Design a protein around this ligand. Structure first.
Ligand SMILES: *C(=O)CC[C@H](NC(=O)CC[C@H](NC(=O)CCCCCCCCCCCCCCC)C(=O)O)C(=O)O
Length: 39
């Protein structure tokens, strides 16, 4: 539905930011960094 397009895009926008924070956390060390992951 119209929502299907938007909710999926809006989550893609957010999911992307969430994933990018996870990548920046992996770059920081991942479990090695010491900081919990963005979760
Ligand atoms: C971005 O585009 C918008 C996305 C947004 N969706 C969410 O925020 C979904 C979050 C939701 N989690 C929570 O809201 C946190 C609370 C979860 C509570 C779970 C309760 C489970 C048991 C309930 C039993 C009820 C029994 C009957 C009572 C009469 C999630 O993870 O989905 C949006 O706006 O859609």
């Amino acid at each position: 539905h119209a929502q299907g397009t938007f909710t999926s895009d809006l989550s893609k926008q957010k999911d992307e930011q969430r994933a990018k924070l996870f990548i920046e956390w992996l770059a920081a060390g991942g479990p090695s960094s010491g900081a919990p992951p963005p979760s």
